[PDB]
Amino acid sequence: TSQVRQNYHQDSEAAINRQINLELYASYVYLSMSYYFDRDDVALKNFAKYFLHQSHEEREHAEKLMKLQNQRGGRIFLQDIKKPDCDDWESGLNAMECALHLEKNVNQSLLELHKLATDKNDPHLCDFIETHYLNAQVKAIKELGDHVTNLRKMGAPESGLAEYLFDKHTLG
Amino acid sequence: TSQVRQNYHQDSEAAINRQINLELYASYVYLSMSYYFDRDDVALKNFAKYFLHQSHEEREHAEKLMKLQNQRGGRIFLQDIKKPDCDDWESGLNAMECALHLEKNVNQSLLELHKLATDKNDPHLCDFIETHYLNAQVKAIKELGDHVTNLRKMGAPESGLAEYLFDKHTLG
Amino acid sequence: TSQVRQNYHQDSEAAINRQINLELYASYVYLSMSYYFDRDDVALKNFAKYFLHQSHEEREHAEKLMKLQNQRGGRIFLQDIKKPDCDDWESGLNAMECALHLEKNVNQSLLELHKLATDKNDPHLCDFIETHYLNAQVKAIKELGDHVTNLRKMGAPESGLAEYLFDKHTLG
Amino acid sequence: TSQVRQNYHQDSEAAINRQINLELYASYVYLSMSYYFDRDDVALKNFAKYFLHQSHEEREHAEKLMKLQNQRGGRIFLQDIKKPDCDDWESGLNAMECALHLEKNVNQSLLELHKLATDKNDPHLCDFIETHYLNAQVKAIKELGDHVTNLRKMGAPESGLAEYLFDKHTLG
């Protein structure tokens, strides 16, 4: 048993490992989305940049959880990072909707993680989740919601013009 | 025979002269396209600027091949530069599609040139083509492909609005 | 078929997708190694920093291959990123030896990729591999070899002092 | 009763006074450790500096709790600050191990304090503990764990060389 470990339940340790995998998975989804918009037959460079940045952010979220695992004296256990559900993301709007769904899924995982930390009376872990993750998710979800709304109102995905102009004005 | 010449096949020499002509021809095509968009009844100033820059770049590509010819001890032999196939380029989209076709043609000529250089075991010439031309063509072809895609998705050439907005957002 | 595609064999396309997966896998291995040295019972902070940087570099290598795939008009197809072979990397020396083995494996994959590109007479792809990958691998392999040598000569892995001092002088 | 007091249980008030004493006690332990390494027959100047800084930090932690007591309308009640358990700390490693034990003890007191604040439904006090103390303890405990690990691996306390080099490379 680790010399630093204190008030850190084995269940929380495992949950943090699961969250690490989910963060890496989200990174992979955004990476895939990014390069979809880099295709010569899609060619929306700011969608590509937007999702690539989101991908790098998710890798940062994973790293911070790996740091936390070690901080508390838990042991990191990695699993395969699953390929994203889709190869062809269809359109700017569809990618945004998939991103919204991903972020809400990640948020639900974090809320379950927080419930466990609360159940195990781990206020350090509760504070960690709240501080670094919960509002970050709420902000990300609000942003994607805003984006989906604008694309829909502008006439996407039918209007190729709409996705083009959104790429320039919102993501540019 | 030139005091500098070494491992430079007469076939490669002739192929380099042919490539020089093709580069000058591409310069001429882009020059013609440029001023088409400068017409008062077309009036897309950023299309005009975009193609003029492309025209100057092609002249640079020709000059570098003339430099190479002399570097290797070959002798430059120039031919007439043919006028472009078209006087009226129709629309922004059509010009972009013609540019894409030109660049793919130039690329095929360069790949044939590379095949010959390989056949004649001329690694200096192979490296020259690879370094200065091959990725330049791949980048140019990708860019034009991206442009054609956006114009099509935006509704060109029917939508005069589409070509106008593309002129401002992508080429501006 | 892609409007930009030219001289790009389907076999090369698939090989590039396989290489993308391998680059992401290498990123994952280095990420795992990094946090191993961040454990309170290992606690070599410069080993951790060194491998984390290597991990980020591998993600850059993957992204550039995804860019290339689109540049040539191929289509990206992602697969699961396998977890690294090891959870516990044992020691600084052992991690370095595993890194050396990984880089030599990645190098062999790149040489096979180059052989295919040569077989299919794709000089753009040959140049791409040579320019961005081949010397990078040779440099990485030489560096890891140097590191393994120093750690061995210093008395690792038995000498805890040796790994400590190497962490400070070579990786610091 | 204080004009500012609101939702502040008498039990929490007393617990905060106990925590103030513990913070001052920790300050005293680190002060004693510091000057042990300043002895002419120990003479590790960076161990001395490291612990002196830790001592000043603990005094800051005590002051912030005294501030909090007044903020909430509680009344500060001070008790004797007990001398540290040891006069002679034996070695760099032993001092680090004693520091680790102290910080884990202080952490347990803070977790008990948080449990009480939770029991009394005092979210301001919960947030105060989480914000200013809980992660600070986790970080301190991780650091000391790392230090103990390195000293052990380097051969301390038998190796006088090990403590000397650690003093220079880690604490310098």
Ligand SMILES: [Mg+2]
């Ligand atoms: Mg998992």
Ligand SMILES: [Mg+2]
């Ligand atoms: Mg984000």
Ligand SMILES: [Mg+2]
């Ligand atoms: Mg995340």
Ligand SMILES: [Mg+2]
């Ligand atoms: Mg599957």
Ligand SMILES: [Mg+2]
């Ligand atoms: Mg999806």
Ligand SMILES: [Mg+2]
């Ligand atoms: Mg709370």
Ligand SMILES: [Mg+2]
């Ligand atoms: Mg909080």
Ligand SMILES: [Mg+2]
């Ligand atoms: Mg916050």
Ligand SMILES: [Mg+2]
């Ligand atoms: Mg504007």
Ligand SMILES: [Mg+2]
């Ligand atoms: Mg000719």
Ligand SMILES: [Mg+2]
């Ligand atoms: Mg050009």
Ligand SMILES: [Mg+2]
């Ligand atoms: Mg040219």
Ligand SMILES: [Mg+2]
């Ligand atoms: Mg004629």
Ligand SMILES: [Mg+2]
């Ligand atoms: Mg034409």
Ligand SMILES: [Mg+2]
């Ligand atoms: Mg190059």
Ligand SMILES: [Mg+2]
């Ligand atoms: Mg507009």
